[PDB]
Design a protein around this ligand. Structure first.
Ligand SMILES: *[B-](O)(O)CCCCCC
Lengths: 548, 164
């Protein structure tokens, strides 16, 4: 997901502005749905929500717009159990042997004969939660096992939290409401208001460990592999309690990253660190936020946001609609030099031409150079020390950069990586004259619709995720609900789309209508006021009631 | 008195729901979403109830690409009656009313649906829903940033035998 909030110091109108670009599945339980909710006098919010939820998850009101991105904070901890040497179904806490609780669940299973048979399954549980096994990594032997404690299991506040957000007036009010309830499960919150405040919040439900406990309670090997693993044989490694927290064992709001500014804030699924590099966020628990090198999407955004020039709504919109593959900025120049140093290698001929013709984008008309670039980058990432300028923590926005072609070993592997990537591409059934849009589609009934965008790992702000199905790439997730909000005097001007349309049902008139528009990248008005809604020639109305 | 909603649709089928309370508001949301996505919600509720194997057998998968039986085991464990009751008791009156309204609105569409925008009419899993079902979906959403990512790992967790 991407999110950009712009304040009074940077916006062309001196007012707030927000671009909401979450990246979510195009099917299933997390498929966004547009709606506008009003209880006259005390509620008026519009945006998108998830199936089953009677609140708006991402949206805007009279003076406020907000959105979310998935954070990098941990919302659970693994616990390595020290098993009783006499009994692998018992585990030790403070040297004392405790029994595992066993909960059996019964499942009805339909056979081909259509008969229902009953399957019983035992779920083993510790004081921390259920046991989990990753064969070859997290095993359950006679020495150790692993349990998982999910913080959001006790989060009964999630619905009230979004309902409260739906009622928020401005950025300050939104912040109060979110910090007071701590009901946001696992996302960042970014917002902007008419007054021109831009807010970033890493305010979610995060397991709390007092700072002095961390170096003793962590499992070094596992945390180095990105797992929030703790020592489960020590009672002192239980989540710390702070009466200020809305929930026992979670991190108090005062200790979570917040940035309130009037220039801008952004997030593309990296930590809170470089939300705005002018004011870096540091000094948090590793469970909360770390100073990791940012992904190409954030790096792209910051390259468009840094500076003194006023930001327009059009500028933010085109950050999405341009479909620029930003990772090509770091490697393609030197890759083309390589292609020039190796003319008449024959094996490299098709690839070097395609890469040279390529518009460095993931548009419908983008050439096969994108495909070659993708396969190459998948191999280039597996090479060791091939960046000319490796990551410099003093230059986190401009590094890494370039291919170290002045080192003969590197030049050897990069050319091999290219020849391999080329080989894979020629092998596949890709016709000549094939553009990216001919490849990436979304199926609607018996037809296809070409979809612009590419994988976010390649620095495409308009992130689109697809898998190979038959002759094509079928979109499964990515850019979904788009919302760009400004605050002119009349009221909120909201602009965007729901990329995959309102209905998942092929029989509906709204099964592919917005999808056709997304293909053409033609965003639309999101009507909010009574006058905007009345001005719609497609306006329909129905009043329903029934006895309670 | 008691469940009532005014609904306006603009271009592309975007619903605009007006009501005097949370109950009426939920009523409109449930009806409108059902008109667009009744089959989707029905399938996902089956998943959250851990009944995929019951309706579809063990060879199939959920929309999250989990085998039906492991998925059913996970969600049966996750959404036990005791868990759902505690969650419900912890809800504010406003939220309870939203959910009650949603369920009633969704169910009203089901009763009157003639297949115009619903491809799964007649299917046994397409049925009236309850507030508990919405709680099951909410909890499923909650654990997506945690134990939900370890659904397969939870199902696979078994004590060692007499090996080596
Ligand atoms: B994005 O890929 O971080 C997903 C964000 C979804 C926000 C849900 C409210």
């Amino acid at each position: 997901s991407n999110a950009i909030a712009v304040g009074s110091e940077r916006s062309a109108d001196g007012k707030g502005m927000l671009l909401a670009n979450p990246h979510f599945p195009w099917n299933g339980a997390m498929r966004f749905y547009q709606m506008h909710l009003t209880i006259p006098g005390r509620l008026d919010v519009m945006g998108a929500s998830l199936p089953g939820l009677p609140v708006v998850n991402i949206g805007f009101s009279r003076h406020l717009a907000w959105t979310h991105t998935v954070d990098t904070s941990s919302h659970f901890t693994l616990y390595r159990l020290a098993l009783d040497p006499k009994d692998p179904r018992r585990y030790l806490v403070d040297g004392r042997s405790l029994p595992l609780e066993e909960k059996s669940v019964a499942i009805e299973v339909r056979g081909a004969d259509g008969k229902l048979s009953r399957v019983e399954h035992k779920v083993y549980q510790s004081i921390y939660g259920p046991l989990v096994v990753w064969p070859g990594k997290l095993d359950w032997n006679r020495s150790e096992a692993y349990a998982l404690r999910d913080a959001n299991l006790e989060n009964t506040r999630v619905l009230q939290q979004w309902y409260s957000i739906n009622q928020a007036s401005d950025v300050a009010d939104l912040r109060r409401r979110v910090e007071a309830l701590q009901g946001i499960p696992w996302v960042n919150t970014l917002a902007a208001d008419e007054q021109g405040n831009a807010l970033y919040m890493n305010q979610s439900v995060v397991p709390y460990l007092k700072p002095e406990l961390i170096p003793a309670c962590a499992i070094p090997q596992l945390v180095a592999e990105g797992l929030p693993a703790l020592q489960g044989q020590d009672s002192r490694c239980a989540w710390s309690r702070d009466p200020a927290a809305a929930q026992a064992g979670i991190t108090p709001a005062a200790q979570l990253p917040v940035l309130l500014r009037r220039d801008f804030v952004q997030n593309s699924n990296d930590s809170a660190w470089l939300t705005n590099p002018a004011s870096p966020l540091q000094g948090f628990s590793p469970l909360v936020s770390q100073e990791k090198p940012i992904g190409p999407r954030a790096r792209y955004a910051l390259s468009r946001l840094q500076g003194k020039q006023p930001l327009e709504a059009k500028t933010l919109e085109e950050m999405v609609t341009a479909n620029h593959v930003f990772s090509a900025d770091q490697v393609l120049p030197d890759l083309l030099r390589l292609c020039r140093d190796n003319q008449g290698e024959k094996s490299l001929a098709r690839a070097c031409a395609a890469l040279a013709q390529w518009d460095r984008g993931a548009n419908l008309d983008s050439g096969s150079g994108f495909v070659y670039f993708q396969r190459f980058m998948q191999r280039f990432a597996e090479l060791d020390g091939a960046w000319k300028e490796p990551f410099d923590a003093q230059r986190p926005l401009d590094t890494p950069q370039g291919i170290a072609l002045d080192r003969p070993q590197v030049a050897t592997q990069v050319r091999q990586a290219l020849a391999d990537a080329a080989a894979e591409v020629e092998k596949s059934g890709i016709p000549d004259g094939a553009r990216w849009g001919d490849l990436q589609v979304s199926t609607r009934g018996q037809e296809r619709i070409a979809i612009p965008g590419g994988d976010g790992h390649f620095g495409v702000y308009n992130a689109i995720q697809s898998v190979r199905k038959g002759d094509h790439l079928e979109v499964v997730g990515g850019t979904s609900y788009i919302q760009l909000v400004t605050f002119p005097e009349e009221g909120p001007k909201a602009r965007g789309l729901l990329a995959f349309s309102q209905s998942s049902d092929p029989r509906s008139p709204h099964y592919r209508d917005q999808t056709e528009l997304f293909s053409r990248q033609q965003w639309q008005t999101l009507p909010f006021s009574d006058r905007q809604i009345d001005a719609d020639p497609q306006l329909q109305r129905l009043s329903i009631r029934e006895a309670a | 008195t008691g469940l009532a909603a005014d609904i306006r649709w603009t271009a592309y089928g975007v619903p605009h729901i007006r009501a005097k309370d949370e109950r009426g508001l939920g009523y409109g949301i449930g009806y409108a979403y059902a008109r667009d996505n009744a089959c989707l919600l029905a399938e996902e509720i089956v998943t959250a109830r851990g009944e995929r194997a019951r309706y579809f057998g063990s060879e199939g998968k959920s929309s999250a690409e989990l085998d039906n039986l492991p998925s059913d085991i996970f969600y049966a464990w996750l959404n036990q009656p005791e868990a759902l009751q505690a969650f419900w008791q912890a809800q504010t009156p406003a939220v309870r009313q939203l959910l009650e309204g949603y369920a009633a609105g969704f169910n009203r569409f089901l009763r009157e649906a003639d297949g115009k925008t619903t491809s799964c009419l007649g299917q046994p899993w397409l049925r009236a829903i309850a507030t508990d079902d919405l709680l099951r979906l909410t909890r499923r959403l909650l654990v997506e940033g945690g134990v939900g990512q370890f659904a397969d790992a939870l199902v696979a967790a078994a004590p060692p035998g007499a090996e080596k």
